Every structure is written in C-alpha cells, then in structure tokens.
Symmetry: C2
Subunit: 325 residues, 2 copies
C-alpha cells in the first residue's frame, strides 16, 4: 500500500543537510512518508547553529518504526565519525565516508523493499576518494552498489520527457563510443521506466544523431548503421518505438503530444529543449531497481552552512520520488 | 528608398509560382520590388490560372520601376527557349536562367541599384547541366560576390542565431571546426548586427561540449582563443557558454545574438518556440534571404506549393535592407 522515500544526506560538509531540512518543512513534504538517512548528531548540530531550521528529529532503527506527523523528521542514524570536527565546505575524508555509507544504507533498504524510491542529496567526489571509496561519481556509486550496468538519465516533465543515451562526455567522445547495444539498452530502459510510471503502451521516439537525421532525404551514417538496427530490434520485441527522427522537430512533436518520451543522443540534444521551455532542475536515474532522483547542483562548498543555499530543487526531487514510487 | 530584387530560381520549379503568389499579399503588393526572371515564362504562368491576376511590367533599369498595387516589375532575364519549358524537369536552359538571375541580382545589389536580394529555390543538377559548376545556391552567390566567408542567420525579434556550420553531419562539423572559422563568424555577427541597428552588439558564443567543457578540449583550444581575439578587437563577446542555457539567455534579452556551433544547436531552440521557414545569408556585402524549401519538382506548376515562406523571406529582406 503505502510508499516511502529514503533521502540520503550526501556530504555533510556541503548543502545536503540544510537543503533537506528546509525542503521537508514545505507543505506536501512536511509529515510525509519520508526517512532521512544521515548523521543525527550533525543534524542536531546544524539546527543549534541556526543553519537548519527548528524541527523535531526522531531516530528510528527500521523504516516501519516511523510515526509520520507534521514537524517531525525521522532519521536512520548513520553517524559521522566525529560530528564536532566537521568544517563547512571543506574536503574531508569522514564526510566522504558518511556520504558513501548513506547511499549504501539507502540501497540496502530499497533492496529489501522498506523503501520504494530514493532522493539523493549531492556528494563530493574528492572526499569520497579521500575516504578510500573509489567511484567515478555519485550515480556510478549507486550503480555499482545495486549491480546495475544499465542506467540512463531522465528529464521528466508533464509535457516533455527525455532519456539520454549519453550525458557529460565530449561530443567527439560520444560519436566515437556510440553503439547499437547502448541505444538498444536505453530504449529498453525508456520502455520499462514508462510502464513503471503507468504508460501501458508508451510511444518512444528516437532522435537522430545528425541534423534532419541525415542529408538529402537519406539517413546518415549513425542513423542507418547504429540507430535503425536498435529501433528495428526493439519493435520486434513489442515496443512502440519510432525514428530516427530529425533532432530539430522530435522534441517539439513529443511536446505536442505525439510521443510519451524522446531518446536523446547526447547531453545538449536533450537539455537544450528542456531548459528552453518553462526544468526544475531535477533528474531521474532510470534503470536501477528503484526510482532515484537528484538535483543538478553539487555540494556547493563555497556557500555550505551559510543559509544561502536554495532548497527548491531538493524539494522538487523529493516530491518526484514520491510521485513515481 | 531601399529596393529588393527577387530571383526566379529554376523556372521549372516552384520559384515563379510562389513569387507571384507572395507578391499578391498585403505588405508585398506594390512594395519596392523588382523580379528578375523570364517575363515570357511569368506570362505563361499567368495564362494557366494557378495564381492571382496581376499586371507585369518589363523594366531594363531599376530607376524605371513605378511601384503600385497589382503591378509586378520584371527585369527580363529571358529563357533561351520559353515555349519549350516543361514543369518539374531538369533542363539545361532552366539552370542557366537560374544562374543569370542570381548573377544579375548581385550586380544590381553590389552596385546599389537594389539594397537586398530574396531568392527563390534553384536546382543544382539543372545548374551543373547548364555548365555552371557550383555546389549550391549560397556558394554561387559567395563566388559572384567575392565573399570567402558567410554564415546562416536565423532572425526573430527575441532570438537570433548565427551558425559556424549547417546541414552537415556532426562528425563532419567536428572535424572541420577551427579557431579561424569561429573568429570569422563572430566578426560576421558583429558586422551583421551593426547593419541591423545594434550600435554595440552583445554576442554569446555557444560551447561544443556539454557545459562548454573537463569534458572535451574545443572550448580551451578553439573557442577561448577566438573569443579573446574578438574581445581584443573591441567586440563585446561572451563565452563559451553552456549550450543548454545560452539560447535561453539570448531569448530573455541577455544577448543580441548567439553564435551556434552546429545546425541542431540553433534549430532545435528556434523550432521549439514555433518559428520558419527562412534564413539570412550573412557575410555578403548586402542582405540575402531565402527559405528552406527546394524546387519541389513533383508539385511545381500545379498550384499546390505553399508560398508563405517565400512571403516571409521577402518581407524580411525589405525590413533589413
């Protein structure tokens, strides 16, 4: 019946703690089925410095032990080694270790179904490495812990949904490592994500790599060599998938209601159209065994613990977890 | 003052058809416009009852034109054999006419007899058969006009974009990108913008890689040197900017123009806001505009080709002349 989201603290030297408490004070998050995984001592300490606003914090050992009520945040206490020793906005091994242990604990709760979705506050890669946790980044850490090779970034709005074959890599890199297997995988993830969120027979449009999907009313090299084989393979498997479509009309058409989702090829191909319309700025990592959301800012060490950080996107990313759980 | 020359393009295609239709519209009807094409084929077109009825007036010189509603002035650049013209066919005489109209318009423009050109589409196959070896409409003009460098501009009131490259594959674009070419397009943009009334243009340059870069070297190796060079010449240029916010910020008013790297970078944003079918070729000595349609040989001379684009193309050339 009831669906619960785990929220991970991230790097406690960053803005994670303060943006969670703030976000949780907002209507529709206040007293909601949410559990914070993080350092209880650190949360008490930030409240006492007046950073964090006033709220009752209740430790629980198990998710089921929560008694949800406005004005109470429930916490699975993963402790910082020395809470009194934490400095705002510096790279610290114990803060990177805590960040690691929270996402570890969150995925364990998800794996046994105590929690249905996860919203992650940001962590610092350099601190993670300093703690001896060797992962290329937050998302990759989630994927390793979860034994998921196959995941992709989703931008989710009412009117436009986009999943990316690739994100955060040079354009030359994207062109040189593009493969049929990857496109196929991402189409699969798109199909599964959309059914999980209640599209019984989703329409997926696949964007071309090249302008117009090619020149002179012919598909281009990637389109015919890589994309068409993935589309064809995916239709034969029962998926309602179209393309390759001209990049400069495909997102417009999905926006206008012709498709439920677009498979974008590279980062900017998907992010340009999302941001140009009225993005907030949250993303879903699709292809894990549970829904996971995060926001696009980082730890913001320069403004951590000053009351300047904005909790808007942390809030959006938590409400989104709840919706899609 | 400002007068605009309109070229016929390939007479077998939709050029003649849509020129006539568009010039019947309000704003274009009786406006300072000179068509350069074969009077005889425009006559033939008229007899077929596929257009509004209009009086055609042969002029040898632009100063002869007497602008009034319901009269289109033509500079008679004749087809070698007007009666032998078939619709939607690749014909040597048709491509040769397309070439002479362009040549003729550019001569008038270069001279100041006209202030802008708006082109109707031509057929490259037909152009090569007539012995004119040019890769296309735009390259033809660059040559006739001694302009090594030009770039495509998409022009709206709130968002304006110039392109380092267009149409080509992503890989081709990556492999043929250079600092020199970025410097050139920044300079074309600056010059274009002053020409349309921005005394001090503010120009943004889009990155190649997501977040204009740690991911790829074009920003530091190609884009930054070009921008540093632009700013040392007194231009107000920003970048490289994350492609996923720069067009948004241009749209909001932060920049007068964005220099896009490749086709979709500029076209995704423009189509998404709901704007066609037209562009400006910038970097020539005068304004040229055109629309994205080809000769449409399959529907030519039936009356079914849309003239809207062509009308916008001409309206824009007038505005900017």
């Amino acid at each position: 019946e009831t669906k619960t989201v785990a929220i991970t603290m991230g790097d406690p030297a960053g803005i994670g703690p303060e943006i969670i408490v703030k976000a949780l004070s907002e209507d529709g998050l206040n007293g909601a089925p949410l559990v914070v995984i993080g350092c209880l001592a650190t949360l008490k300490r930030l409240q006492a410095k007046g950073i964090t606003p006033n709220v009752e914090l209740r430790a629980i050992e198990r998710v089921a032990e929560a008694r949800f009520a406005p004005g109470i945040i429930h916490v699975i206490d993963e402790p910082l080694a020395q809470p009194e020793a934490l400095e705002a906005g510096k790279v610290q091994a114990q803060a990177g270790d805590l960040a690691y242990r929270c996402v570890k604990r969150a995925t364990e709760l998800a794996l046994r179904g105590d929690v249905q979705a996860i919203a992650t506050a940001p962590l610092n890669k350099e601190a993670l490495h300093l703690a001896g946790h060797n992962y290329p980044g937050h998302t990759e850490l989630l994927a390793t812990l979860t034994h998921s090779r196959d995941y992709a970034m989703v931008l989710y709005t009412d009117k436009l949904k986009v999943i990316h074959v690739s994100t955060h890599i040079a354009l030359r890199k994207f062109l040189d490592t593009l493969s049929t297997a990857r496109v196929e995988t991402v189409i699969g993830i798109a199909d599964t994500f959309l059914k999980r969120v209640g599209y019984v027979k989703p329409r997926i449009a696949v964007a071309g790599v090249n302008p117009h999907a090619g020149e002179n009313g012919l598909f281009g090299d990637e389109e015919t060599r890589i994309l068409t084989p993935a589309i064809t393979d995916a239709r034969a498997k029962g998926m309602d998938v179209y393309g390759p479509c001209p990049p400069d009309t495909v997102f417009l058409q999905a926006y206008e209601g012709q498709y439920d989702m677009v498979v974008a090829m590279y980062h900017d191909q998907g992010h340009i159209p999302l941001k140009l319309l009225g993005y907030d700025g949250v993303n879903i990592t699709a292809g894990l065994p549970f829904i996971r959301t995060s926001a696009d800012h980082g730890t913001a060490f320069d403004i951590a613990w000053t009351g300047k950080a904005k909790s808007e996107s942390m809030a959006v990313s938590i409400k989104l977890a709840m919706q899609l759980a």
